[model samples]
Target: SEIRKDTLKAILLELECHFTWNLLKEDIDLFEVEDTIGQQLEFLTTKSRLALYNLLAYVKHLKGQNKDALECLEQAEEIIQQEHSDKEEVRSLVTWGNYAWVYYHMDQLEEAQKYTGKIGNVCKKLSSPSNYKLECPETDCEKGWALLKFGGKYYQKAKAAFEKALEVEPDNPEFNIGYAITVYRLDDVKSFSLGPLRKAVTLNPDNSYIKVFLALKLQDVHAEAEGEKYIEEILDQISSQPYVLRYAAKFYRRKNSWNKALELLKKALEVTPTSSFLHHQMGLCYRAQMIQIKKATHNRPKGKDKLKVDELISSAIFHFKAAMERDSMFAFAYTDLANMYAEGGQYSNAEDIFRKALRLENITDDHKHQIHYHYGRFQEFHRKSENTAIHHYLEALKVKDRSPLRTKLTSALKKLSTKRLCHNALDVQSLSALGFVYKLEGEKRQAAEYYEKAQKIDPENAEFLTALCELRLSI
Candidate 1:
């Protein structure tokens, strides 16, 4: 289908394809796929090749590589026609369906429409309705659930599939929960998740996962009383459940109950020890405890407090390592571990881990920005390389979706730019830039000083003189 925004919205309102547990196992599956792309491409059976290319097309589409997605879909179609020619109608349905979505995403409306028709025809011939309704709620849901668990780039497709499943079986617990989570992850729309989650909880009252999810949604909407009630019930009934424990641990962590969070995470670890997420949470808890100790013992340094801080840090590092052991592709753990190493005066170790983090291709841009920001801090503080740190901070600022890290990076860059220019005392351009940085920071006196210094270097520099005049007027 051409699948324009309006059509997409209609499908969603009518409950169509819209796009969680054992997450470590899912991570394991994703890791295998990510690992293959990291290494040389391996040979695949014809059917497997079709599936691989189709999935890769979706991945490419999500990554904003339209042409590459098209090329992948083309490859998938070639494989189906070459190997399953006699059964192309049924065998190529999956590839054709993906082709429609990919083409629509690429804005190749004609091709998307053509594939949509092809999929519809094939579905009808096979006694199914592929374009709009799959005619099998369970199958659509099963497929949707797979994609949802597959995570990352598959979320959009997962949401669509879940919508289709829910349209057919609106009250189905599996479909409802699937739709709730898919919508929650897919958007920030409270209504999209709240309604389905409430229904899911109603349908499966004993399901702690549904309750936890609903509570989380309530928390998002500032429904604290309802959310706390749900949380309390979950704690009493299913505190041992891995997903429940994970969310509960996060709740406690946000409450600044680091020890409670650590305990809950440890309990969850008993169920899913290999979960990088749980291990990462444990690391965060330990890091928080360490910070607390350091702050409390600010004046009692170089004594038992030092030993306690070191012990807490060691625990944090251990958990961080444990997290990466389960999922070596986890960029967050790597970033945190690198930061800890830098803090512990292990400069070489920090640099090595940061290099690995930057080399990861599957991380989000936010994570990449975090990596750059941390590396910038490491260079600035550990190596005292102001210019190098400034370069890294600038790169971090260029990333999309600015965060608090951007603010920190900007502040660091401003300070470093000023320091670097001051080190180069005689450069008029450097002095002018330093003056601009101070002006941006609202330090009018420092700005005026730098501007005057720049004017002294190049007496007729209009930019410096103008800036100096402005700062003097402001003062």
Candidate 2:
């Protein structure tokens, strides 16, 4: 359809890349690829996200968000330059290829040629036979390393790519670290990631991230005291590094050092205002502070403490909203914001946020249940609707998964069932719902007892009888 289009295309035809190779695509949905990259960027956990950032850029190109792709490539360049500026930068070659490709596609031919010229300057001086492409381990290692963090589906492909890179440069720290990292991905803790983790740390002493992984592996293997040594060492020196600080905040949060966690989050947010995870963490850390204030006052503060509680609630709501603004697909932020609105007595606002949260196209089952359970809590505790309450909570218990939130969900429904029992002792729906929740938790006698109560109300009620028989049959 267009000879002029491939004129720029033919100019860069020698390069192998995301756009040229058609390595990224749509069977899994381009939105999903974008979604995962967005999710990963919130955390930015990996040592080097150059490959993914590049891929994300390429992905954006495919989706017609051409200008948006530049940011991704910019980040890719930033990471590579920060981490590995010394290799005389064939890595930049791939980045330039992508840049030139995107620019030309957008009909910015001058902007496109500028990068093509940039690529030519590097290419001629570069050792590769074609000047445009180089089959080197560094390049191979990047693709290999990128795929590992690309998610589980691409792990095997990542493994092979790393293998090819290692074959060429087995002792190289970057390649060795990459190899060890992939090993750390599969059955890692089960197979014991300690050795490879330590090896990555040993190979790349400058990489604070691998050191963190090694420290975590140490903790995972029940050596927390030893892990803390590395954590504290890295914590003091890498004070300004947001990526390391994110994990440090996680470490502190896990250890119940909420004040320290909060401090680190503020520090990180100051540096990387772009991080959705930091804002989300900031929201959650404040949530803990608010919870403790409620706990101290038995959840009904007055005077100065009440004002403090109000400030904390509003702070949490603001950051949770900020997190979702940065990442529209952030389901937890949506759910937490809805609950916070309800918690702060903004029932209409709560209902609206809950509606949007539930309508999200992609959400985790664990998160879905969080929304459901909290929405149920909102109805029962604040809005006063038992029928709506039961619908939401039962949907939570019905989900076939485990969560730390289970006890709260179970207890609320149990409490509701008991109160409804006194109000309408003959309500079979509450009785059986209680029975179902009990049965799922393996409280057989308790399940059968509730089932019996409902059965007594209506002996021929099939739902109660069916549940009773499962208990009766098991016995």
Candidate 3:
């Protein structure tokens, strides 16, 4: 057993599968990923059930459910046989690689070697120059799917994988859809997905999900009526699908039709009651209504108007809590729930939730920036603590990522500091922060003005003096 073990390790590492894909356990929330995959299995109409099953099998193995993982692996093999009988051997490489790894982990070396032998035979049949490896679109597609599920850190790698597969066969529906979805989620310019999503929509006539994405990309480009046409087509034809409904709900929400969006969200919730996404949307809808009421009444409501705002606040709280409970790693729900608490006049609860959210494991940088931005707003408006708010606003600017939220945060800081100058006319920190914001915006003259003011107020403050020197040199 000891003599051949090194060979076994070499064989395992040579396989192109999720086990060797560097999907570190620490990088992923296994339970959340498992639940999401299960939900996709139950509702999503994608043609990539094979990919989902493969991912579910790997996730199950990670979660110590090797028995169930094997079961999912069996289903994945069945899919290859049913869907790609001609290329069954090609499609089975990823599934076979997973089987070998799972069996090896279970201490069934013989069973593991059996699948390795099969992979070796297929590689030979393909006349590959490499040993235990085959370069094909199927494997690329599988890798793309796995990278995508591993979360945002792997999005660029996932895009590359799908792009390679598309290079081999650009018209492949599965490859096309994967590439489009990957590009859409990149946190890049929304315009980047418009071309690929349009291609995906035409290539995948049976796929309503991509069409919803197309509508969303169109909406981002100010083609609202055209976006409505695509979503309206989905609702009229396939509104019963929970996956489609929640996204459709987002489109309507963006259109500012709260009740219309709410109707779609409720229908989606009935089917996938534990969906964190649907709950988040429901929370947002109620929150939007409350905001509209507060704006319309100028923050002072009479009897029934006051009651309406209260009811909306409570309802938003319930759904946001439900969202956070269903998916503990859902960062947006934690932040949104915190904001809703602030709206309810429970400042301490809001503070507690924000602290908890900032502590979430693997929370992405962009999301942390968003939390900091909102925390600053909460401090400024609800608690009326401009000092703490300025601190948080600076913290958000520290991320250095490009986003519309960053733009909004910049504007908020600019407004606050400009107003503070009018009132106090000598607050050094506000002057320092506004100078920092102006420097970021490349307005050197304005930046210098504030920096000079801060320097005049605190000549002994090294930081203020250093900032002025830097700005003057730049000018």
Candidate 4:
């Protein structure tokens, strides 16, 4: 099947955008002259030969074929060089931006920077940018202007250039998204200022690239509630995009609406059944909700639901274990499992699981250190291995980021140094362990003294409320 001239031109016009041609300013009707040349090029006539070469090179550049496009540009130059070198402003500008974008895409930042600088210099020498929606001085050059400026780290200049492009064609989705994205990156503004991002999404909901950026940005500010609105709107407007559902689930989680989160996550999983992250998150939410129910009942020792709460917490443990099977690297799941073990008085198992979690990749070092610190707590209580526990705690301090937990460990260690507990003598680890036991036993004053001793050596760690919030219940 062959496309008619009009349809072919429409397709080339789309091709111009899909490749993110930044050579000419974005305009639907502006590429008529170029498309005409492309159509004639198809016939291979003598008059159309040179123009056809230029059009092909233009397409090549858009597709990131820098070397080939450059070679073609040279040939096109050879054809027109003797006739008129100074008259091909449109062709030359297109080549320049194409050169820049090719380097940018190749990750050759220095070379890319060179062409970006060249665009301004060349544009100035040629004339003002008057190619808006008419004969484009270059192909989607305006669209690329922002990217070029951004690649060269000219943030302010890029914003200005993109803004200029948008002013030329306010209704163009490319210009709208390009300028808004640039404006957002101009400085460290709030990540959730969705005004511009939302505009882009509203204008182009099918734009997967735009949707991803908008979705991530929305996550920072709107969290769950606002994200739900955005997700629902997208689902209503476009049924083909499934990524939105995943983000919607995350939003629900942020809102602490566990049931809604689970439903949305399940929907996303149905679409992308192999996503390990989704499965893990779902398992975590189920377990967490049950854990919350257990804690609520645990606060009242004489409550009639106390027995039921224990069963619920056990159910939570089961779900948490299932989460680990889906994503073994899920740090929080490991920590939660360890916590559950500690709650059930299986301190040794808790310590081992925490250690296993610390070995996993893709986990934040700060989180790993927290596991180490908590693991030391269990060891101290279960095995009464004060020296070993202290060493583990020290290791925790070594890798731990700037957090309040370090202070609590320090204070606890200090109080134990002076005290003659259990056999009239105890090391830092033993004293801290005994102090924690006391804390868990409801001897708050004694616990505070031991925790204070640990705090003095590591003031930064003292900011945590670990000892204060020690999770234990007298069975």
Candidate 5:
């Protein structure tokens, strides 16, 4: 009983933080593991499942779907009932807390009160000192903020906690700011973040961080006139702050103000040179500028403009290399470097980096998909090996949620499959590919056989006829 009491206290303390949650490099990796948790959902225990549902409900609610959030809480409740109905006073504490949150957000105050009453009753049953204070909504809100800071798996609790806190102290700037930021993190582009953020700003007018956050939210809505005021103010006031500079740069980058973004990013890089992300962002800016120049100079003579493009590519490569040096597990940096190598016809180097990326244990399935996709492209265009490229594409498709890459990989596989259809000499279309594969393997006789068969089938097919003639000439 003492062991259980101590464990429950530890978990509660872990959930509720006493101070403001600051953004740092360490916290950035937490966001990257969304797909990681998603991939592990099926193996979760009942307790973990209840927690996950609560987390997902917060995410859906953040995306402005109240109905979805309610469904998630309902699922969580069902799980608690089935698994821990008798022990719910202890085991289902978090779930009941989460219920109060979802109901409150849905404007069902009566329903919210019901869950709150349950929490009070459970706290009374617990003789432990730590568990006694766990009934407070303020503490629940604090736990939510802590979970929000952790990101990924904690988002649901963060949302519910904040909702509970706001229920007790409706105008608390800290709770509102935390709630707003959590929602913003969940759906930055389109979210119900503006209301909470605006309310937070009004509640704490002197909080510059809140102002900067509001500025970012406004920028997302294209309310530049209002957003710019906050941005410029913060730029002058917190010029040395890395996140402020990064956020400002992000705004400019989104607006296609390439030079402005670079200027801000360079300043940020000077402040935090060891930051892998800053270097990566710098590389992205340079790469984008290079692409812009290429589009502008397409079909023109290669001279000074070509030299400029090369310089940009070189700069991008330098930054990407710097990022990798700072963090060897920087999978995106590896992919970008490999891509540049492939484009420059350094096929072997590209292949080496792609393999290196695959060996990194910290990389997600998405990164694997990227490496496979890029490696396939390298094989298809740089190595001119269709069969090998197709093999890579097939592997890439096995990874879930390839998004934009999925369509592209599918198309490439279809085209390659069509061409690989010729299994023998009788197949005219793929005879050249088949012969090429045989030739590479040093099967000269087999290569010649396919080429001759192709020539017989389509005598005027210039590629097949030429290959056959070349084989005969070599003989």
Candidate 6:
């Protein structure tokens, strides 16, 4: 095992660099100096190419070259075929774990799962015994961290792996935060809305990761004020961290303070311009402002003010595009973009984006339902596809997380099916675009039903009341 000696040393060295990078992202300045380190690593070590590849993959990851990081992983796998390294070694599992993370960041869920399966298989082969070294003390923690970073359904697995790490070395702060995030993601499934992970903050009150999870989860619950308070502490503790600003943006967004959110998001964007999460939040902040403008215009109850939406809506669309252009898989940004297109008399574009968004990886059925819901409405009005629209609405209803407006969507679809016409009000003025579609088809009842619904939603809504009274009187 001459090769083993070199690999063991290389792995240990890489771990040191990796640990330092995480602890001091801004201070270390490692990303710019990776090529220098790679040069130093160029000895014709007796280590297998797979071992070399695994170490280099992590270094690439630290440099924020995730695509290149994956190439290193593939090279490691290729080495396995050529070099005949034992699949049972701890190194293989470690490599798989790293690969899972790379794929997760790229939004390649299927590939991530493939490596996750490898991790499970390797872990199983070790018999869960005390003697097994299949779970490297360092590697599994990194795997769990990766899962948490790209969190969704993988949080539970991340938690279990981190727990295993803690079992070997008890009460480590990193493992505690990891476990807490998994618990937070479990939502109501975990106890008291703030589970064992919350204890990490009490045990280590200065911990930012713990605070971030509490803030992220509590934002949805009654204790959001507490969450925000902890997040503020974290931000103060880590003053210049980009993630801190991003958290502040979420805090402002939840409070409906668009300018405050925008300022913080802009700060975060400058720090981590490539981050999809930050871009998506920025898009939402802008869209929320636009919603406020739209509401103000709709509730004006007078002329001139009603036209304010045209200008504001145009501005909102600009931010939405900025978000998507920054990161195409920001599904919420795509959703906002689709909504903009729909409202801008571009139903064709709206439907296309919604359908494309539905194809994004790691999406919940809830998101799919949203896409289908709007797509159905657009199709009903513009595509004149009643049966297809009904099909999409039914598909949306089957989803576990339908929007609060589902009842209205279903009701509209039913009305359209029976009346053979569309009657959705989308504009701030009566005889609006969708309403006129029904009027032109001579389905006065359907048109009136929509007009009345719109009016009911906003009693003084100029668009709703005008469409119903003025259009009816004219006809």
Q: Output the number of the lDDT-best candidate.
A: 3
lDDT by residue (tens digit), candidate 4, 336-433: 78877887788777877887886765555556677777776775776676666665666676575346686766654544443436466454455455
Question: Which of the numbered candidates is closest to the native, going by highest TM-score?
Answer: 3
Q: Choose 2 or 6, whichever is better by TM-score.
A: 2
- Winner on TM-score between 4 and 5 is 5
lDDT tens per residue, model 3, 155-186: 99999999999999999988998999899888
Give each prediction's root-mean-square deviation over alpha carbons.
11.5, 9.2, 5.6, 17.1, 16.0, 15.6
- Per-residue alpha-carbon lDDT of model 5 for 1-475, expressed as tens digits? 4664444333333221221123232333432223222322433346545555655555555446778777877887788787745555565566565566556656676675676566666666675354423555545664675477465546766787798888888988777877887777766368588888889889977655677778878888889779878877767655555556767777777667888888888877676666777788888888877877788878352888888888888999999899888777667898898998887788888888888887776555666777788888888998999877876776676663335676677667657856666563234535554565455455778889877776777778876766666676554
Model 5 alpha-carbon drift over 4 Å, by segment:
1-133, 136-146, 149-157, 188-192, 208-221, 299-304, 380-394, 397-419, 422-475
Q: Put down candidate 6 lDDT per residue, 376-453, tens digits, no spaces.
A: 777777778766676666566656323575666556645655554446533222223335446445678777866766
In model 5, state the lDDT of residue 269: 69
Model 3: residues with Cα > 4 Å off, grouped in runs: 1-6, 25-28, 43-47, 187-189, 362-373, 376-475
Candidate 4 off by > 4 Å = 1-227, 235-243, 295-315, 358-364, 377-389, 403-475
- What lDDT, from 0 to 1, does candidate 5 have? 0.67
Report the Cα lDDT for residue 5, model 2: 68
**Runs with alpha carbons beyond 4 Å of true place in candidate 2:** 1-15, 20-93, 108-134, 148-156, 179-191, 289-312, 339-349, 360-475
Instruction: Spell out the clash pairs found in candidate 3.
Output: none
lDDT of each: 0.69, 0.74, 0.84, 0.55, 0.67, 0.60
Q: TM-score of the candidate numbered 5?
A: 0.58
Q: Count of backbone clashes for each model?
A: 10, 0, 0, 32, 2, 0
Q: Comparing candidate 3 with candidate 4, which one achieves the higher TM-score? A: 3
